[PDB]
Amino acid sequence: MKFKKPPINNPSDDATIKLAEAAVSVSDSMLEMAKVEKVITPPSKDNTLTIPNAYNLQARASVDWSGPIEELTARIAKAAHFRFRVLGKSPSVPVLISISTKDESLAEILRDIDYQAGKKASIHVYPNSQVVELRYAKIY
């Protein structure tokens, strides 16, 4: 009758212990402040209006990217068989994105890119003309 308790994993490093302890505190600070911002200014509009879906926007992708926005958007448009268009001047300080997902549709990839672009750039999709259009902000 040997006694045992169920989770028996691989051994752990105390560096990873300390890193995990810092990360948990960062995480609930982020959660509390996000709750406050949602309460203070409730959003009203959604980018499904600017990026609707279509047929052959339902091919799927998994992505690991850590660079500027324009080349990645060009790769997605080329995989979706759409034309690619740029409006405005690119800024001198580049617009950097970071996406790490698994198995989602190309429309949601563009919507996540659109959310991370923020105040610097925007994504529009015209399905009747089959055009993906990225436009830069009139800042600087």
């Binding site: 799927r60 998994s62 995989a79």
Partner: protein, 93 residues
């Protein structure tokens, strides 16, 4: 899964940016049933390849159904030579 492991061990030898996985099948019931079938097949295969350590930045998956045959002899079922999955890429530098 031994064959998929062998293919993953082949894919780790190169350096690359994007991989495309596309699945094609043969005509059974309607257009929709095999479009759904090929999409499901490509989703599962690309997931196991991503689970193993292929160092790609993008994997695209699509399923074309039975739209693009490579052979006019269509007498088999799944035994037919034109029900297949194709993995294509470009070697980078």
């Amino acid at each position: 899964y031994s064959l998929l492991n062998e293919i993953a061990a082949f894919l780790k030898q190169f350096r690359k940016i994007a991989i495309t996985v596309t699945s094609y099948s043969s005509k059974y019931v309607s257009v929709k049933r095999e479009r759904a079938l090929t999409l499901a097949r490509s989703r599962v295969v690309s997931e196991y390849l991503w689970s193993q350590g292929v160092d790609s930045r993008i994997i695209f998956t699509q399923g074309l159904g039975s739209d693009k045959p490579i052979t006019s002899y269509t007498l088999g079922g799944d035994r037919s030579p034109n029900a297949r999955v194709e993995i294509t890429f470009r070697r980078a530098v």
